[PDB]
Every structure is written in structure tokens, then in C-alpha cells.
Amino acid sequence: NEIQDFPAEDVQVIVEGNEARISMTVYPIRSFKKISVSLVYKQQTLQA
Amino acid sequence: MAVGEANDFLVSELKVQLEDQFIGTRTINTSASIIKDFIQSYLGRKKRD
């Protein structure tokens, strides 16, 4: 749980001479700090 | 006279009992079934008498 997710298909590696070229993507870990609850009230009808 | 007396007693008793029983109660999911069961009981008691 140190990271959220990562697109494994998008990992790329290229080598030329002694140049280790790496490029990737990572979805960072985060911790909740705001919660939005949109509550809605409605009326229900019952038959028997 | 008799019919009118029966109609008046029926309406008054139903009005009183419904107002005593179900006014101020909670509108729960089984409210309609309970009401229906209470009316059937009441009509079956009338029919018995």
C-alpha cells in the first residue's frame, strides 16, 4: 500500500551504449482529508 | 332508523379507533399491511356481531 496503482503496460526501457533510459507512470498514495456527503430526501408510497 | 343507526355507529367507531390507533404512529414499511390487518379484524368483528 505504498502506492495506489501503476499502468504496467506503460513501463518503457531503452538502452544505448551505457545510457539506462527509463520512463514510467505511478498513481501516488494519498490519505483522505475531506468528505462530501450529498444526502437527498425523497417520499415513498406503499400499496397495502 | 335502523340502517341510519348502523351507519352512524359504524362510522363513529371506525373514526375513533383509526384516530386513536394510527395517528402519531411511525410510517414504517409495514404500515399499510398493519392498517389492512386492523381493518379486516375490525370488519370481521362487526360481521361476527
Query: Residue B21 is placed in which grid cell?
Result: 390507533
CB B1 within 8 A of CB B29: no
Query: Residue A24 is placed in which grid cell?
Result: 514510467
A13, β-bridge pairs: A22
Which residues of chain A are within 8 Å of residue B32 when distances are taken between CB atoms?
46-48
Find the helix or strand (DSSP H, E) in which A19 lies: strand A19-23
Q: Which of A42, A45, A46 to mutate to test the interface with B (most CBs of B within 10 A)?
A: A46
In chain B, the N- to C-terminal Cα span, in Å, equals 19
Q: Which approach determined this entry?
A: cryo-EM
Closest chain A residue by Cα to residue B39: A48
Resolution of the structure, angstroms: 4.0
Which residues of chain A are within 8 Å of residue B28 when distances are taken between CB atoms?
none
- The upper half-sphere exposure of residue A9, i.e. CA atoms within 13 Å in the direction of its Cβ, equals 0
Closest chain B residue by Cα to residue A47: B32
**DSSP letters for chain B:** -HHHHHHHHHHHHHHHHHHHHHTTS---TTHHHHHHHHHHHHHHHHHH-
Nearest residue to B9 (alpha-carbon basis) of B36, B40, B46: B46
